[PDB]
Amino acid sequence: KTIHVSVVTPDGPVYEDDVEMVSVKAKSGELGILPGHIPLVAPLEISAARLKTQYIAVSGGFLEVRPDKVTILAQAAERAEDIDVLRAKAAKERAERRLQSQQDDIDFKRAELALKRAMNRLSVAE
Amino acid sequence: ASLRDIKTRINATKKTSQITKAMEMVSTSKLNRAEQNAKSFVPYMEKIQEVVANVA
Numbered sequence A: 001k002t003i004h005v006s007v008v009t010p011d012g013p014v015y016e017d018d019v020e021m022v023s024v025k026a027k028s029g030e031l032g033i034l035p036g037h038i039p040l041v042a043p044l045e046i047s048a049a050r051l052k053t054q055y056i057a058v059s060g061g062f063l064e065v066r067p068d069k070v071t072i073l074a075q076a077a078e079r080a081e082d083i084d085v086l087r088a089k090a091a092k093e094r095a096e097r098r099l100q101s102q103q104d105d106i107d108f109k110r111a112e113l114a115l116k117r118a119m120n121r122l123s124v125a126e
Numbered sequence B: 001a002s003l004r005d006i007k008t009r010i011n012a013t014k015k016t017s018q019i020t021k022a023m024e025m026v027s028t029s030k031l032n033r034a035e036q037n038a039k040s041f042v043p044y045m046e047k048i049q050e051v052v053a054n055v056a
Helices: A085-125 B002-055
Strands: A005-009 A011-019 A040-042 A049-053 A054-059 A062-065
Touching: A005 B002, A011 A054, A011 A062, A054 A085, A062 A085, A085 B002
Parallel strands: none
Antiparallel strands: A005 A011, A040 A062, A049 A054
């Protein structure tokens, strides 16, 4: 039998499949999860989630396991199976994010300059 | 009463109508993407809400 994994971020679902062994590590220690496991909640440390294979590095992270609901609530879940690739992805997405945060503001202010000149000409036209 | 001034005022307010219509269209697209972000956030909120309920 297999158990259904679904790693969930606030940004959206990252991974969803049926994996036999889930080998996440908690704040206390390791946990080896099989189908038919006891209902338990355990907070995950900032490390990879070993799914037996594809390894998922989570940040923040909180695990709740039911015998079919072994889903993981992570604040940031990469894919590339390394502990620092989430930090590299965060360093790239901060750059992309402040580029978008400046792009949206300058686009609004260009459209607002168009509106302010177009209503200037209306007020001058009298 | 200043026919040329009336026509320049007509053309100016047509230009403002066009600009505010373009901004309406841009805000329709941004509303669509914002409600897409909300419906992509909602399963995380459902799961963490039921976990907080069952624990606390």
